[PDB]
Design a protein around this ligand. Sequence first.
Ligand SMILES: Nc1nc2c(ncn2[C@@H]2O[C@H](COP(=O)(O)OP(=O)(O)O)[C@@H](O)[C@H]2O)c(=O)[nH]1
Ligand SMILES: Nc1nc2c(ncn2[C@@H]2O[C@H](COP(=O)(O)OP(=O)(O)O)[C@@H](O)[C@H]2O)c(=O)[nH]1
Ligand SMILES: [Cl-]
Ligand SMILES: [Cl-]
Ligand SMILES: [Cl-]
Ligand SMILES: [Fe+3]
Ligand SMILES: [Fe+3]
Ligand SMILES: [Fe+3]
Ligand SMILES: [Fe+3]
Lengths: 193, 194
Amino acid sequence: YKDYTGLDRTELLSKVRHMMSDKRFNHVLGVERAAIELAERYGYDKEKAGLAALLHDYAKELSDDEFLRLIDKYQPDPDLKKWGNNIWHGLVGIYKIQEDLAIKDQDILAAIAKHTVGSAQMSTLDKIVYVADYIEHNRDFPGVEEARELAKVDLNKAVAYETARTVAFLASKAQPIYPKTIETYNAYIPYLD
Amino acid sequence: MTYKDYTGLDRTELLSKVRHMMSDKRFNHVLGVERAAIELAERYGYDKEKAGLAALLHDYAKELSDDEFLRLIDKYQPDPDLKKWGNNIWHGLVGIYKIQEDLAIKDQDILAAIAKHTVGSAQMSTLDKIVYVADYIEHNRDFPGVEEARELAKVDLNKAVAYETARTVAFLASKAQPIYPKTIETYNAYIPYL
Ligand SMILES: Nc1nc2c(ncn2[C@@H]2O[C@H](COP(=O)(O)OP(=O)(O)O)[C@@H](O)[C@H]2O)c(=O)[nH]1
Ligand SMILES: Nc1nc2c(ncn2[C@@H]2O[C@H](COP(=O)(O)OP(=O)(O)O)[C@@H](O)[C@H]2O)c(=O)[nH]1
Ligand SMILES: [Cl-]
Ligand SMILES: [Cl-]
Ligand SMILES: [Cl-]
Ligand SMILES: [Fe+3]
Ligand SMILES: [Fe+3]
Ligand SMILES: [Fe+3]
Ligand SMILES: [Fe+3]
């Protein structure tokens, strides 16, 4: 990752860990492990995959006010301020990552930005991060084990399954559903037919 | 303003033509929706005739052939994306052209409420909401939580709208069926009522 960050993995782990709780940093390590496994399985650059996965939740624990300032400074979209952390920590978090690290790679940053909501046409790296986040080994929740099996077989099916489960979950709790989420939903459900 | 004022047929002639468009089971559904929409109109201070008429006509095109719909799309509202969907989406949005072909109805409120009865919109009129809810709670319906919808409809029409839309999004997602984007526009607009 030094090629991407200018830092050894040891300073990098220090920086990431100092942004979040123990429990969350373990999640992030599990996501790194899972993304590297997925990259191996699907013929993708393991270093890009692991680095995007290590960084993906870098901003997860920023406060609302800190996000509102990053919005104002870097992407002042009126609608964006109506949402919250779930949406912000990836989409707006990338600005924090760039402030704190010498990361410029647009593939990595884009995979991080959309890790929560996806998009239509996700790249292989986007999908690796998206799926690793859901299936990493510390996770236990309704839908993970089917997700793990699918991931071993077809990345696009895993993407579809994860998205369908998340929409169902949000709807069951009457929580707002980000419009990109439904874009991702409709684009990938054909894989499950 | 009677059904005849709106359509040029009296309710008796309407009921025959509507019966002709569909199976008995569907026609009974439509009578149930008419009944439910009239009750919702009384409950919420809305014109009972408009509500009853929109309800009677809402599924006029439910059993048109796929080919009839595609012809209608070409002829009246060319949209290649629309063509990618199916009966669920078409029968309201494209069905209103069939209704206008067969009936002398021009009322834009009634037509708009029929057109969106499946998917809703973000800024639904009272008539829109009455048809949308009546469709879901009509007395022939027997599905889990229909009694929750019925109860909410007795108390707050916007909540009933919110509940129905959250139900439908969760139902579709739970089996990985496509979700029409207006459906999510309705969902996000009405969930704050819950
Ligand atoms: N309100 C809302 N929440 C979402 C949407 N998509 C995902 N989420 C939620 O965002 C939360 C965090 O998602 P994610 O970044 O994927 O995982 P995490 O950061 O490792 O917890 C989860 O509770 C998801 O349900 C959406 O479209 N709208
Ligand atoms: N594909 C798709 N189907 C939907 C959507 N919203 C509702 N439906 C379905 O369309 C069907 C017809 O719905 P509706 O016109 O409300 O009821 P009906 O005509 O009395 O059966 C149902 O099975 C709904 O779940 C959507 O957004 N996308
Ligand atoms: Cl680990
Ligand atoms: Cl590696
Ligand atoms: Cl599971
Ligand atoms: Fe996250
Ligand atoms: Fe995560
Ligand atoms: Fe219908
Ligand atoms: Fe109906």
